[PDB]
Amino acid sequence: VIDAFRLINANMMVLGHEPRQTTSNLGHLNKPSIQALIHGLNRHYYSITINYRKNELEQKMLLNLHKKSWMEGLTLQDYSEHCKHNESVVKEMLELAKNYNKAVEEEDKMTPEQLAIKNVGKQDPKRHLEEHVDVLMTSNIVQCLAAMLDTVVFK
Protein backbone atom coordinates (compact mmCIF):
# COMPACT_ATOMS: atom_id res chain seq x y z
CA VAL A 1 0.00 0.00 0.00
CA ILE A 2 2.63 2.34 -1.30
CA ASP A 3 2.19 3.52 -4.88
CA ALA A 4 3.99 6.31 -6.83
CA PHE A 5 1.55 8.49 -8.61
CA ARG A 6 1.39 11.41 -11.04
CA LEU A 7 -1.01 14.38 -11.21
CA ILE A 8 -3.89 14.44 -13.77
CA ASN A 9 -4.88 18.06 -14.70
CA ALA A 10 -7.29 19.00 -17.46
CA ASN A 11 -4.08 19.62 -19.59
CA MET A 12 -2.50 16.29 -18.85
CA MET A 13 -5.63 14.26 -19.82
CA VAL A 14 -5.99 16.19 -23.22
CA LEU A 15 -2.22 15.48 -24.02
CA GLY A 16 -2.44 11.88 -23.09
CA HIS A 17 0.31 11.91 -20.53
CA GLU A 18 -1.37 8.97 -18.57
CA PRO A 19 -0.35 6.07 -21.05
CA ARG A 20 2.88 7.79 -21.54
CA GLN A 21 3.83 7.01 -17.82
CA THR A 22 3.28 3.22 -18.09
CA THR A 23 5.85 3.23 -20.88
CA SER A 24 9.48 3.08 -19.67
CA ASN A 25 8.79 0.62 -16.80
CA LEU A 26 7.17 -2.47 -15.48
CA GLY A 27 3.76 -0.73 -14.97
CA HIS A 28 1.89 -0.62 -11.73
CA LEU A 29 -1.90 -0.04 -10.75
CA ASN A 30 -3.03 0.22 -7.17
CA LYS A 31 -5.51 -2.12 -5.27
CA PRO A 32 -6.83 -0.99 -1.72
CA SER A 33 -10.54 -0.33 -1.66
CA ILE A 34 -13.06 -0.22 -4.56
CA GLN A 35 -14.34 3.35 -4.05
CA ALA A 36 -10.73 4.69 -3.74
CA LEU A 37 -9.56 2.88 -7.00
CA ILE A 38 -12.37 4.10 -9.33
CA HIS A 39 -12.47 7.63 -7.91
CA GLY A 40 -8.71 8.03 -7.71
CA LEU A 41 -8.06 6.86 -11.24
CA ASN A 42 -10.36 9.37 -12.93
CA ARG A 43 -10.02 12.57 -10.88
CA HIS A 44 -6.86 12.14 -8.74
CA TYR A 45 -4.02 10.32 -10.50
CA TYR A 46 -2.46 7.84 -12.78
CA SER A 47 -0.45 5.13 -11.14
CA ILE A 48 3.14 4.10 -11.89
CA THR A 49 5.81 1.84 -10.41
CA ILE A 50 8.20 1.77 -7.45
CA ASN A 51 10.97 -0.89 -7.48
CA TYR A 52 13.72 -1.11 -4.75
CA ARG A 53 17.58 -1.14 -4.84
CA LYS A 54 19.47 -1.57 -1.61
CA ASN A 55 23.19 -2.33 -1.58
CA GLU A 56 24.98 -5.10 0.27
CA LEU A 57 26.30 -2.60 2.85
CA GLU A 58 22.68 -1.43 3.30
CA GLN A 59 21.69 -5.08 3.85
CA LYS A 60 24.53 -5.57 6.38
CA MET A 61 23.27 -2.57 8.45
CA LEU A 62 19.66 -3.67 7.91
CA LEU A 63 20.42 -7.10 9.55
CA ASN A 64 21.53 -5.72 12.90
CA LEU A 65 24.49 -7.68 13.77
CA HIS A 66 24.50 -7.76 17.56
CA LYS A 67 27.08 -8.84 20.10
CA LYS A 68 24.92 -10.56 22.81
CA SER A 69 22.82 -12.16 20.00
CA TRP A 70 25.63 -14.62 19.05
CA MET A 71 27.00 -14.86 22.65
CA GLU A 72 23.76 -16.59 23.92
CA GLY A 73 24.47 -19.57 21.79
CA LEU A 74 27.46 -20.44 24.05
CA THR A 75 25.79 -19.24 27.27
CA LEU A 76 25.13 -22.33 29.49
CA GLN A 77 21.61 -22.78 31.02
CA ASP A 78 20.95 -24.59 34.33
CA TYR A 79 21.45 -28.43 34.55
CA SER A 80 18.44 -28.67 36.87
CA GLU A 81 16.49 -26.58 34.40
CA HIS A 82 17.22 -29.16 31.61
CA CYS A 83 16.15 -32.01 33.96
CA LYS A 84 13.06 -30.24 34.95
CA HIS A 85 12.17 -29.49 31.35
CA ASN A 86 12.88 -33.07 30.27
CA GLU A 87 10.31 -34.24 32.85
CA SER A 88 7.77 -31.48 31.88
CA VAL A 89 8.02 -32.38 28.14
CA VAL A 90 7.38 -36.07 28.87
CA LYS A 91 4.13 -34.96 30.61
CA GLU A 92 2.83 -33.42 27.29
CA MET A 93 3.62 -36.69 25.45
CA LEU A 94 1.65 -38.69 28.01
CA GLU A 95 -1.52 -36.89 27.02
CA LEU A 96 -0.91 -37.46 23.38
CA ALA A 97 0.15 -41.10 24.16
CA LYS A 98 -3.46 -42.21 24.92
CA ASN A 99 -4.63 -40.91 21.49
CA TYR A 100 -1.39 -42.24 19.93
CA ASN A 101 -1.97 -45.91 21.27
CA LYS A 102 -5.44 -45.98 19.67
CA ALA A 103 -4.30 -44.32 16.36
CA VAL A 104 -1.46 -46.85 15.76
CA GLU A 105 -3.76 -50.05 16.00
CA GLU A 106 -5.08 -49.57 12.47
CA GLU A 107 -3.35 -47.33 10.01
CA ASP A 108 -3.59 -49.99 7.14
CA LYS A 109 -4.75 -47.76 4.28
CA MET A 110 -3.35 -44.52 2.91
CA THR A 111 -2.86 -40.98 4.42
CA PRO A 112 -1.57 -40.98 8.02
CA GLU A 113 -3.63 -38.03 9.02
CA GLN A 114 -6.94 -39.59 8.09
CA LEU A 115 -6.09 -42.81 9.97
CA ALA A 116 -5.00 -40.97 13.03
CA ILE A 117 -8.32 -38.81 13.26
CA LYS A 118 -10.41 -41.93 12.42
CA ASN A 119 -8.93 -44.21 15.24
CA VAL A 120 -9.04 -41.13 17.60
CA GLY A 121 -6.44 -38.36 17.77
CA LYS A 122 -7.04 -34.86 16.22
CA GLN A 123 -4.55 -34.16 13.28
CA ASP A 124 -1.40 -36.12 13.95
CA PRO A 125 -0.68 -37.48 17.43
CA LYS A 126 2.82 -38.44 16.20
CA ARG A 127 3.60 -34.85 15.19
CA HIS A 128 2.60 -33.33 18.51
CA LEU A 129 4.80 -35.84 20.33
CA GLU A 130 7.80 -35.17 18.04
CA GLU A 131 7.64 -31.22 18.38
CA HIS A 132 7.54 -31.72 22.12
CA VAL A 133 10.83 -33.67 22.28
CA ASP A 134 12.53 -31.46 19.52
CA VAL A 135 12.39 -28.14 21.57
CA LEU A 136 13.88 -29.87 24.66
CA MET A 137 16.43 -31.83 22.65
CA THR A 138 17.46 -28.58 20.84
CA SER A 139 18.15 -26.57 24.13
CA ASN A 140 19.88 -29.59 25.89
CA ILE A 141 21.98 -30.56 22.84
CA VAL A 142 23.48 -27.05 22.20
CA GLN A 143 24.12 -26.41 25.96
CA CYS A 144 26.05 -29.72 26.30
CA LEU A 145 28.08 -28.89 23.16
CA ALA A 146 28.82 -25.41 24.56
CA ALA A 147 29.55 -26.54 28.18
CA MET A 148 32.27 -29.07 27.43
CA LEU A 149 33.92 -26.48 25.10
CA ASP A 150 33.95 -23.46 27.53
CA THR A 151 35.16 -25.47 30.54
CA VAL A 152 38.26 -26.70 28.58
CA VAL A 153 38.88 -23.30 26.85
CA PHE A 154 38.75 -21.10 30.02
CA LYS A 155 40.70 -23.58 32.26
Binding site: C144, L145, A147, M148, T151, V152
Partner: peptide, 9 residues
Protein backbone atom coordinates in the same frame (compact mmCIF):
# COMPACT_ATOMS: atom_id res chain seq x y z
CA UNK B 1 36.02 -33.70 32.92
CA UNK B 2 32.93 -33.87 30.84
CA UNK B 3 34.22 -34.20 27.22
CA UNK B 4 35.35 -37.85 27.08
CA UNK B 5 33.16 -38.93 30.10
CA UNK B 6 29.90 -38.04 28.52
CA UNK B 7 31.01 -39.60 25.12
CA UNK B 8 29.65 -39.34 21.55
CA UNK B 9 28.79 -35.66 22.03
Amino acid sequence: PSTELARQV
